[PDB]
Amino acid sequence: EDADEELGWQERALCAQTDPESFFPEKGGSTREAKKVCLACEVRSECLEYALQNDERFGIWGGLSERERRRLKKA
């Protein structure tokens, strides 16, 4: 369009159009919904890179949970 400017990859996150509470389950909640949503987001690689760089162990980023991020970070 005529915006001619991009703030970054945040503006192009699919999860913005979806329940923000579904990415932080609670009391035995599931993860299939958010993980399925992430697999269509275009900036998934950028989201995962940002999550790894900031090394936060809460919520799910890039389509992976906290445990998956820990396992990936082990190497």
Binding site: Q10, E11, P20, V43, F58, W61
Partner: protein, 85 residues
Amino acid sequence: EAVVPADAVSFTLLQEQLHSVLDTLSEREAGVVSMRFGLTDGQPKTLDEIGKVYGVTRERIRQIESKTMSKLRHPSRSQVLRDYL
């Protein structure tokens, strides 16, 4: 060293937006964040006092703060607050 009206109105809008965003969270999470950063009274509090009021461990209180802090810094609730930073 005067009050620029644009900056004052911007700060007031930021305060309103922060209160609105913190409302979407649960009561416990919003309360712990408010009493940790002292939004209501401007008096920062230690983790142990927060646990005392909540009757939980200090480390457990530290756990809650991190969860909410990451929740706000997510690519689903950040864009409502990105501009003000």
